[PDB]
Design an enzyme around this catalytic site. Structure first.
Site, PDB file in Angstrom:
ATOM      1  N   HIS A  41       0.761  -1.017  -0.007  1.00 40.50           N
ATOM      2  CA  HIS A  41      -0.136   0.028  -0.103  1.00 40.50           C
ATOM      3  C   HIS A  41       0.940   1.309  -0.033  1.00 40.50           C
ATOM      4  O   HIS A  41       0.218   2.386  -0.043  1.00 40.50           O
ATOM      5  CB  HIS A  41      -1.084  -0.130   1.135  1.00 40.50           C
ATOM      6  CG  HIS A  41      -0.603  -0.027   2.645  1.00 40.50           C
ATOM      7  ND1 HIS A  41       0.149   1.294   2.939  1.00 40.50           N
ATOM      8  CD2 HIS A  41      -0.557  -0.790   3.619  1.00 40.50           C
ATOM      9  CE1 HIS A  41       0.474   1.110   4.341  1.00 40.50           C
ATOM     10  NE2 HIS A  41      -0.059   0.096   4.347  1.00 40.50           N
ATOM     11  N   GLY A 136       2.260   5.851  10.336  1.00 42.73           N
ATOM     12  CA  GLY A 136       3.730   5.675  10.025  1.00 42.73           C
ATOM     13  C   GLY A 136       4.389   4.533  10.620  1.00 42.73           C
ATOM     14  O   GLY A 136       5.414   4.216  10.334  1.00 42.73           O
ATOM     15  N   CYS A 138       3.386   1.386   9.889  1.00 45.67           N
ATOM     16  CA  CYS A 138       3.061   0.518   8.509  1.00 45.67           C
ATOM     17  C   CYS A 138       4.528  -0.125   7.978  1.00 45.67           C
ATOM     18  O   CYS A 138       5.533   0.633   7.999  1.00 45.67           O
ATOM     19  CB  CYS A 138       2.137   0.968   7.398  1.00 45.67           C
ATOM     20  SG  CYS A 138       0.666   1.506   8.008  1.00 45.67           S
TER      21      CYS A 138
HETATM   22  C1  LIG Z   1      -1.876   3.086   5.793  1.00 47.10           C
HETATM   23  O1  LIG Z   1      -3.331   3.655   6.170  1.00 47.10           O
HETATM   24  C2  LIG Z   1      -4.295   3.054   6.741  1.00 47.10           C
HETATM   25  C3  LIG Z   1      -4.002   2.333   8.030  1.00 47.10           C
HETATM   26  O2  LIG Z   1      -4.674   1.385   8.469  1.00 47.10           O
HETATM   27  N1  LIG Z   1      -3.026   3.078   8.846  1.00 47.10           N
HETATM   28  C4  LIG Z   1      -2.655   2.667  10.136  1.00 47.10           C
HETATM   29  C5  LIG Z   1      -1.886   1.538  10.749  1.00 47.10           C
HETATM   30  N2  LIG Z   1      -1.594   1.218  11.657  1.00 47.10           N
HETATM   31  C6  LIG Z   1      -1.939   2.188  12.940  1.00 47.10           C
HETATM   32  C7  LIG Z   1      -2.559   3.453  12.461  1.00 47.10           C
HETATM   33  C8  LIG Z   1      -2.864   4.478  13.477  1.00 47.10           C
HETATM   34  C9  LIG Z   1      -3.421   5.463  13.322  1.00 47.10           C
HETATM   35  C10 LIG Z   1      -4.004   5.929  11.903  1.00 47.10           C
HETATM   36  C11 LIG Z   1      -3.566   4.822  10.837  1.00 47.10           C
HETATM   37  C12 LIG Z   1      -2.930   3.782  11.256  1.00 47.10           C
HETATM   38  C13 LIG Z   1      -5.325   4.093   6.789  1.00 47.10           C
HETATM   39  C14 LIG Z   1      -6.013   4.327   5.485  1.00 47.10           C
HETATM   40  O3  LIG Z   1      -6.650   3.331   4.951  1.00 47.10           O
HETATM   41  C15 LIG Z   1      -5.848   1.896   4.935  1.00 47.10           C
HETATM   42  C16 LIG Z   1      -6.081   0.895   4.020  1.00 47.10           C
HETATM   43  F1  LIG Z   1      -7.327   1.023   3.332  1.00 47.10           F
HETATM   44  C17 LIG Z   1      -5.368  -0.199   3.919  1.00 47.10           C
HETATM   45  C18 LIG Z   1      -4.478  -0.519   4.739  1.00 47.10           C
HETATM   46  F2  LIG Z   1      -3.717  -1.386   4.494  1.00 47.10           F
HETATM   47  C19 LIG Z   1      -4.017   0.538   5.539  1.00 47.10           C
HETATM   48  C20 LIG Z   1      -4.685   1.614   5.705  1.00 47.10           C
END
Ligand SMILES: CO[C@@]1(C(=O)Nc2cncc3ccccc23)CCOc2c(F)cc(F)cc21
Ligand SMILES: CO[C@@]1(C(=O)Nc2cncc3ccccc23)CCOc2c(F)cc(F)cc21
Ligand SMILES: [Cl-]
EC number: 3.4.19.12
Lengths: 298, 300
Positions: A41, A136, A138
């Site tokens: 992603h 951040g 991920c």
């Molecule tokens: C990489 O962005 C996403 C996410 O989950 N992120 C996050 C992952 N961990 C902690 C988080 C804490 C707070 C905010 C976001 C977090 C959000 C947007 O939608 C998506 C999505 F459709 C697919 C995806 F695999 C990731 C994501």
């Protein structure tokens, strides 16, 4: 004495954390030999179509204050593999392993390719992890250490609406019925990891906490009827066998410890604690208990 | 989102763990630059432990009595000195993996990570707090002496603890890296007891703010309290007094959540009075006191 939630020493994994930037997205990558693994992603969906449009110079890879040059890119399930010109001199002995629900692993949480924290956790029976991740994080990885070999078992991809986390093994296959797309996704109803609770009851006995023990024993079938009722995972003959060494060390048969757990579920703790906890802990496997109550080093 | 007990990554400290052997005793040492730090009781026999004269035992030792092992390589001791309860073994090789570091003495309530080692090999990492009674509730087996407590704030490792002993209740006592013990403990086998422990009030309040930041509000109430009235109630539950310093430190969390410190104090009073009633806060049925206000802001 003492019992703590303990993670593996993270040094072997810290030497592999890199920052991966593509477009406006910045997340973490795992640099092993001449490949950087990260969530696909980062290119964000038709991932094949999106990836074909990107060129090697679109991926900015940073290892410390040094930029690595991407010489190739390929996708394996939900993980992106960025071929780099330089092999990581800090690459440890490693393998990619897929874990089962109930198994525990250590998580090295990173932001911008820099490790910030390490915590121990379990793959829940609903395939989520109750982690601690911000935006951040991920690309942060889950691992175990066996002798001098790092077993990479998890890579963080997303956060579900309830605050729980979803990710993949290092071959890009998600744990659970999750997808890496913006859509409605919900973690299923969770259950307690029964074999892990029993292992933690043995650790409590090894540490001198015996108040919950009783003279009773149960059949595996009668215990599993109780386990179903209290949203506890079924206990198999494999679990009973795995608990064998702890049963031998403490003198408490596994079905004898099950009758203690059964009474605990029906009657509660009654103001008492076990290992400083008012809840039954299910994030220590039988191996974690043996490792901590014996002192295995890495 | 999510709230976990989190340790600092241990890599910078793993590269400093060495094995120190003197006679029949083997424990861990901390190799920084050309010095190896370790508990001075490594020079004791089991018949010396009750009333050891460490100055007298150390004068009888020579450099070749100390065997230092860094991985599969033996380091050569070229000097030895004692600073309070820590032994400093000068070696002929500077540790190339020596990080940016400093020795810091911490106050009760402060948290730190522990890299538990056996035979100079790291086996686990966990998060700890210095209890108000100056003990730590660790997980240490025989051979863990010399394992260190640390914090890593911006590339610099702050060493704050070195493990020395286990008290009869299973709790642990140790020193800062200058060899000064935390608490009224001594490195002798003489009868020693940890004082009655208390809950770190400022840390519980910080953890209640973390729970609010994570969307948990069930425990909040419409009440406020005076600092004195809160302290009169809290002391009855064996909670540490909350000072104006603690109230000030909680300021940023109070500003972020919109809940005044004395208002959160009233929620805490109510939780102490009622218990949780089958509910949890951040997946816990007890009030957690091993997250400082600094840990909460850092993790959130
Ligand atoms: C990489 O962005 C996403 C996410 O989950 N992120 C996050 C992952 N961990 C902690 C988080 C804490 C707070 C905010 C976001 C977090 C959000 C947007 O939608 C998506 C999505 F459709 C697919 C995806 F695999 C990731 C994501
Ligand atoms: C030499 O180490 C001692 C010790 O406590 N060690 C330990 C430290 N950690 C965990 C332990 C778990 C179980 C068994 C011992 C542990 C032995 C007892 O006497 C003493 C002593 F009088 C003074 C001292 F500074 C250390 C020690
Ligand atoms: Cl086992």
């Amino acid at each position: 004495s003492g019992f703590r939630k303990m993670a593996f020493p993270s040094g072997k994994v810290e030497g592999c954390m890199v920052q991966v930037t593509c477009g406006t997205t910045t997340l973490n990558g795992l640099w092993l030999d001449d490949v950087v693994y990260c969530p696909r992603h980062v290119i964000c969906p038709n991932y094949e179509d999106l990836l074909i449009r990107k060129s090697n110079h679109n991926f900015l890879v940073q290892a410390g204050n040094v930029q690595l040059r991407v010489i190739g890119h390929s996708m394996q399930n939900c993980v992106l593999k960025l071929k780099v010109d330089t092999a990581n001199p800090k690459t440890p002995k490693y393998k990619f392993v897929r874990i089962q629900p109930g198994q525990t692993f250590s998580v090295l949480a990173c932001y911008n390719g820099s490790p910030s924290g390490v915590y121990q956790c379990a793959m829940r029976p609903n395939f989520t992890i109750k982690g601690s991740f911000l935006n951040g994080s991920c690309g942060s990885v889950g691992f175990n250490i066996d002798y001098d070999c790092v077993s990479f078992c998890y890579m963080h991809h997303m956060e579900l609406p309830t605050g729980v986390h979803a990710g993949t093994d290092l071959e890009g296959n998600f744990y659970g019925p999750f997808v890496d797309r913006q859509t409605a996704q919900a973690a299923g109803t969770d259950t307690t990891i029964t074999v892990n609770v029993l292992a933690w009851l043995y650790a409590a006995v090894i540490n001198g906490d015996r108040w919950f023990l009783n003279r009773f024993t149960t059949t595996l079938n009668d215990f599993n009827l109780v386990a179903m009722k209290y949203n506890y995972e079924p206990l198999t003959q494999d679990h009973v066998d795995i608990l064998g060494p702890l049963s031998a060390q403490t003198g408490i048969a596994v079905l004898d410890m099950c009758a203690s757990l059964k009474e605990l579920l029906q009657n509660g703790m009654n103001g008492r604690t076990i290992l400083g906890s008012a809840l039954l802990e299910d994030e220590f496997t039988p191996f974690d208990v043996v490792r901590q109550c014996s002192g295995v080093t890495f």
